[PDB]
Design a protein around this nucleic acid. Structure first.
Ligand SMILES: [Mg+2]
Ligand SMILES: [Mg+2]
Ligand SMILES: [Mg+2]
Ligand SMILES: [Mg+2]
Ligand SMILES: [Mg+2]
Ligand SMILES: [Mg+2]
Ligand SMILES: [Mg+2]
Ligand SMILES: [Mg+2]
Ligand SMILES: [Mg+2]
Ligand SMILES: [Mg+2]
Ligand SMILES: [Mg+2]
Ligand SMILES: [Mg+2]
Ligand SMILES: [Mg+2]
Ligand SMILES: [Mg+2]
Ligand SMILES: [Mg+2]
Ligand SMILES: [Mg+2]
Ligand SMILES: [Mg+2]
Ligand SMILES: [Mg+2]
Ligand SMILES: [Mg+2]
Ligand SMILES: [Mg+2]
Length: 70
RNA sequence: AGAUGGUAAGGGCCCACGGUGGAUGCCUCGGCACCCGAGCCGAUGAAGGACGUGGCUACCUGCGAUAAGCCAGGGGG
């Protein structure tokens, strides 16, 4: 997404505990599956949202992997 | 009576223009040689692979369910 929103996403993710982080990823993964459904019926005009959520999930798992590895 | 020509189904030689074919010249993202530099990787799972991976994705490249990418530092504008 926008570069400032990535930065804010990383500040907030880093204030989350591993349990919060897992629960967020589980939520964003659900929304990603919702995006794939929508895109498969031709309903996702804004297809950039699929990639954005995928990288979001990557950042969150990266920070989750950070917090179990200081 | 005598004699000499017009005939071209087709063919031959030459001239013109085309078709085919891809020589020659020019060209080079490639290659060759020499020199110099530099020289190990791997159970912390190598080399090399299979299968995946993009909103649309046959192949190649990249990457690995965090999947043409994730975090940070440096360069750059
Ligand atoms: Mg998906
Ligand atoms: Mg598909
Ligand atoms: Mg993802
Ligand atoms: Mg005659
Ligand atoms: Mg004739
Ligand atoms: Mg004739
Ligand atoms: Mg003849
Ligand atoms: Mg030709
Ligand atoms: Mg050369
Ligand atoms: Mg070597
Ligand atoms: Mg390998
Ligand atoms: Mg591939
Ligand atoms: Mg696809
Ligand atoms: Mg290749
Ligand atoms: Mg799996
Ligand atoms: Mg996937
Ligand atoms: Mg990014
Ligand atoms: Mg970066
Ligand atoms: Mg930096
Ligand atoms: Mg930078």
């Amino acid at each position: 997404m926008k570069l400032s929103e990535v930065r804010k996403q990383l500040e907030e993710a880093r204030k989350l505990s591993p349990v919060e982080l897992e629960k967020l990823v589980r939520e964003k993964k659900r929304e990603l599956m919702e995006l794939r459904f929508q895109a498969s019926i031709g309903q996702l005009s804004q297809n950039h949202k699929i990639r954005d959520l995928k990288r979001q999930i990557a950042r969150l798992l990266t920070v989750l992997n950070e917090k179990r590895r200081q």
